[PDB]
Amino acid sequence: PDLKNVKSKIGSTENLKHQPGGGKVQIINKKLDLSNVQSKCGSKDNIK
Amino acid sequence: NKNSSYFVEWIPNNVKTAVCDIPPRGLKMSATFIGNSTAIQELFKRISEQFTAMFRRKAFLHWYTGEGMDEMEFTEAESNMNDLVSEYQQYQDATADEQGEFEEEGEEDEA
């Protein structure tokens, strides 16, 4: 009558390494350039 | 006679007089005054300093040039009024005191 300790069929065997982990995000942006500036509403020559 | 201090004394009498026979309608008698006191310097002296202080930052000029005006012409009209201002300032308090047509001659020694 000894069955020889029969094993299960068929399980979550494909999940045994699984968690799963998460990816990443980082946003974060670049500064625009506003260095092209000069005023016009005054005098630079006729002041002299 | 009451004052000479407000009259130009190197113009012997500053006065032009006339007497018309006919008054304005509804009036008995009247007079019209037209004078030139050198005090009037202040007017133009105001105008040509107020001009220059806006012009020294080019304010409003864009509207003027847009009708093709010349930017040199501001400089010219304000210069001309500064000459006109200076005209009153030099004729105000100007001399009744006399000067002769007589030059320096080397006619003496030192004593």
Swiss-Prot record, chain A:
Q: Outline the subunit composition.
A: Interacts with MARK1, MARK2, MARK3 and MARK4. Interacts with PSMC2 through SQSTM1. Interacts with SQSTM1 when polyubiquitinated. Interacts with FKBP4. Binds to CSNK1D. Interacts with SGK1. Interacts with PIN1. Interacts with LRRK2. Interacts with LRP1, leading to endocytosis; this interaction is reduced in the presence of LRPAP1/RAP.
Consequence of mutating S12A?
8% decrease in microtubule-binding after in vitro phosphorylation of mutant protein
Domain-related comment: The tau/MAP repeat binds to tubulin. Type I isoforms contain 3 repeats while type II isoforms contain 4 repeats.
Top-rank taxon, per record: Eukaryota
Which start and end residues of the full protein are shown? 568 to 615 of 758
The record's tissue-specificity note reads: Expressed in neurons. Isoform PNS-tau is expressed in the peripheral nervous system while the others are expressed in the central nervous system.
Per the UniProt entry, what species is this protein from, by scientific name?
Answer: Homo sapiens (Human)
Record localization: Cytoplasm, Cytosol; Cell membrane; Cytoplasm, Cytoskeleton; Cell projection, Axon
* Disease linkage: In Alzheimer disease, the neuronal cytoskeleton in the brain is progressively disrupted and replaced by tangles of paired helical filaments (PHF) and straight filaments, mainly composed of hyperphosphorylated forms of TAU (PHF-TAU or AD P-TAU). O-GlcNAcylation is greatly reduced in Alzheimer disease brain cerebral cortex leading to an increase in TAU/MAPT phosphorylations. Frontotemporal dementia 1: A form of dementia characterized by pathologic finding of frontotemporal lobar degeneration, presenile dementia with behavioral changes, deterioration of cognitive capacities and loss of memory. In some cases, parkinsonian symptoms are prominent. Neuropathological changes include frontotemporal atrophy often associated with atrophy of the basal ganglia, substantia nigra, amygdala. In most cases, protein tau deposits are found in glial cells and/or neurons.
Return the protein name: Microtubule-associated protein tau
> What does the entry's PTM section describe?
Phosphorylation at serine and threonine residues in S-P or T-P motifs by proline-directed protein kinases (PDPK1, CDK1, CDK5, GSK3, MAPK) (only 2-3 sites per protein in interphase, seven-fold increase in mitosis, and in the form associated with paired helical filaments (PHF-tau)), and at serine residues in K-X-G-S motifs by MAP/microtubule affinity-regulating kinase (MARK1, MARK2, MARK3 or MARK4), causing detachment from microtubules, and their disassembly. Phosphorylation decreases with age.
Q: In the record, which positions carry N6-acetyllysine?
A: K9, K31, K40, K48
Which regions are annotated as Tau/MAP repeats?
1-24, 25-48
What are the Phosphoserine sites (modified residues) in this protein? S12, S35, S43
List site positions: Not glycated.
K4, K7, K17, K24, K40, K44, K48
N6-methyllysine found at: K9
**PTM annotation (Deamidated asparagine): residues:** N29
From Swiss-Prot, chain B:
Determine the domain of life of the protein's source.
Eukaryota
Annotated Acidic residues bias: 95-111
Q: Where in the cell is it found?
A: Cytoplasm, Cytoskeleton
Enumerate the residue ranges of region (Disordered): 90-111
The record's comment about this protein's domains reads:
The MREI motif is common among all beta-tubulin isoforms and may be critical for tubulin autoregulation.
Q: Which family does it belong to?
A: Belongs to the tubulin family.
What more does the record tell us? The highly acidic C-terminal region may bind cations such as calcium.
State its role. Tubulin is the major constituent of microtubules, a cylinder consisting of laterally associated linear protofilaments composed of alpha- and beta-tubulin heterodimers. Microtubules grow by the addition of GTP-tubulin dimers to the microtubule end, where a stabilizing cap forms. Below the cap, tubulin dimers are in GDP-bound state, owing to GTPase activity of alpha-tubulin.
List the protein's name. Answer: Tubulin beta chain
The part of the entire sequence present here spans: 335 to 445 of 445
